[PDB]
């Protein structure tokens, strides 16, 4: 069918690499979610033989995601602090994956418009994605602050308190302190809105790795890119409902392990030596 002719020519990892090279694509928006960091060993909330899941049980939540609710934090901070102790998201424990290093390579090639991550693990930053190019749209465990007055709090103090069973408290208002993770009901950082209003409308290509589409406003990012640009989804699930059609035919879904798919993409891009070298240098 003519209406199915794909913007990429061949909707394959090979075709994508060709399209990037032949069209000299320089404005690649990369979006990153929880699927990208599984290979780093990050504890899945939802997995029954995890320590993280065992914990959530006693509390009985209509969702592991209520642990990240600002209203539950004000009411019963022991719950999020108990989860924080188990996830080990403090920078310097987990290491970047092949996806993370790949994004760094796109930056060093001059092809990254912006990397926007909904992960709170800091691995994009650990892979050397620069500050001007990285948006931690949901924050991370790198800094901490009072939720009532927003006064910064020592992350090292917050770490020591959290890991020894103490909920941290503001020295100005007695408010509850947390790491600067954006919780449900909090504002996202400015840099997210910069990316949504200014980067996504000028993307030439969007590669969406391991993300849900069910957390907002983050999920708007690929909705506001031009209607004609390719959107590459690497995910273990058929995500996005009817917002994606896997108006020109421009979406593709690559199932399987996103770590393997990025490695293959890298091969076709001529970046396989640079990637193997980053991967040895820190695994």
């Amino acid at each position: 069918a003519p209406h199915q002719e794909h913007v990429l020519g061949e909707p394959t990892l090979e075709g994508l690499a060709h399209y990037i090279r032949e069209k000299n694509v320089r404005r690649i928006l990369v979006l990153v979610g929880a699927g990208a960091s599984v290979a780093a060993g990050i504890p899945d909330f939802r997995s029954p033989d995890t320590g993280i899941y065992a914990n959530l049980g006693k509390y009985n939540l209509e969702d592991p995601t209520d642990a990240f609710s600002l209203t539950l934090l004000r009411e019963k901070p022991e719950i999020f602090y108990s989860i924080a102790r188990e996830l080990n998201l403090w920078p310097g424990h987990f290491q970047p994956t092949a996806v993370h290093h790949f994004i760094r390579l796109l930056q060093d090639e001059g092809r990254l418009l912006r990397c926007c991550t909904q992960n709170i693990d800091g691995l994009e930053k650990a892979a050397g994605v620069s500050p001007e190019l990285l948006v931690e749209a949901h924050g991370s465990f790198a800094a901490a602050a009072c939720i009532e007055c927003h006064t910064p709090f020592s992350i090292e103090q917050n770490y020591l308190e959290a890991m020894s069973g103490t909920v941290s408290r503001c020295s100005t208002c007695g408010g509850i302190v947390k790491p600067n993770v954006v919780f449900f009901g909090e504002n996202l950082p400015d840099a997210f809105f910069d990316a949504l209003h200014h980067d996504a409308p000028i993307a030439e290509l969007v590669i969406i790795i391991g993300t849900s589409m069910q957390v907002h406003p983050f999920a708007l990012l690929p909705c506001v890119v031009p209607k004609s640009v390719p959107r590459v989804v690497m995910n273990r699930e058929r995500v996005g409902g009817l917002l994606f059609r896997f108006d020109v035919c421009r979406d593709v879904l690559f199932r399987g392990d996103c770590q393997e798919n990025v490695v293959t993409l890298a091969e076709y891009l001529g970046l396989s030596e640079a990637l193997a070298k980053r991967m040895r240098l820190s695994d």
Binding site: E62, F184, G185, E186, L188, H216
Partner: peptide, 8 residues
């Protein structure tokens, strides 16, 4: 601009 949310 709006806050972090999900449809439950």
């Amino acid at each position: 601009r709006h806050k972090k949310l999900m449809f439950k």
